[PDB]
Amino acid sequence: MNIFEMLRIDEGLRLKIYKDTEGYYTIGIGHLLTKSPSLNAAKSELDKAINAAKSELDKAIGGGGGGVITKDEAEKLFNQDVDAAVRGILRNAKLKPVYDSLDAVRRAALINMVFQMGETGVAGFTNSLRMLQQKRWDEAAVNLAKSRWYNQTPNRAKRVITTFRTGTWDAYK
């Protein structure tokens, strides 16, 4: 078990455009395409996030609103998304210290959250954060469970919380 395996569990691996838990068009391992309630815009965004990587340097690659993706391709986006989330943590005044104090397993729980709701979204967890910092596992678990994050995505939050509470991979086993 590891952060990649964790997010693959929690996000799945879909090679065809799908919708998030908010109804938004997404692809790969939880890569948001657009908030527009339009499949067309999605493709458009997809055919822009796909050719963008190895776009200009050399010959073409496709250029066609198919809506499907290559595992490797999904992988790439996945690797960028995770890198982004990690750097959002490090760059965040509030998330950084909490992260710094955490152990490897709890660290991916933090990444996991950042990856799901964004840097600012996680940083707004004033209590939970301070408790994580103080190593008050039980207390932080309880607070997080009282959030709207948990409310909307219970299954996932529980897993995440179990990870914060125990410091083990039990929930993903």
Side-chain angles (χ1 to χ4, degrees), residues 1 29 63 71 73 110 129 136:
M1 186 57 41
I29 306 175
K71 319 181 197 199
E73 292 177 328
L110 195 59
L129 289 177
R136 307 170 54 75

Side-chain angles (χ1 to χ4, degrees), residues 30-50 52-53 60 62-168:
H31 176 94
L32 172 66
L33 292 171
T34 183
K35 297 179 37 174
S36 289
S38 140
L39 179 55
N40 286 319
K43 290 209 218 10
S44 166
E45 287 298 298
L46 180 49
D47 299 38
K48 178 119 84 300
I50 219 321
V68 106
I69 227 49
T70 275
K71 319 181 197 199
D72 277 293
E73 292 177 328
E75 207 123 280
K76 199 196 297 150
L77 309 170
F78 183 53
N79 271 118
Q80 301 169 178
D81 293 343
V82 189
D83 172 270
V86 174
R87 278 146 13 93
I89 282 164
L90 306 174
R91 170 236 291 183
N92 185 296
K94 291 175 193 197
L95 301 166
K96 203 273 211 289
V98 185
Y99 186 68
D100 277 342
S101 87
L102 290 168
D103 56 280
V105 185
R106 303 183 166 92
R107 294 197 164 165
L110 195 59
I111 309 270
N112 188 138
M113 293 185 73
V114 182
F115 184 116
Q116 183 187 348
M117 59 207 277
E119 185 207 306
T120 297
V122 182
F125 286 125
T126 308
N127 262 184
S128 300
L129 289 177
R130 187 193 63 258
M131 313 175 175
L132 289 179
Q133 188 143 197
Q134 300 184 166
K135 300 171 164 68
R136 307 170 54 75
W137 316 125
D138 297 320
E139 302 79 318
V142 162
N143 290 274
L144 290 171
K146 266 73 184 48
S147 90
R148 198 267 280 280
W149 162 58
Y150 182 100
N151 185 67
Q152 296 295 308
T153 55
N155 292 169
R156 196 193 182 148
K158 188 181 16 57
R159 289 200 287 269
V160 176
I161 304 324
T162 286
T163 317
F164 273 125
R165 193 204 3 139
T166 78
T168 90

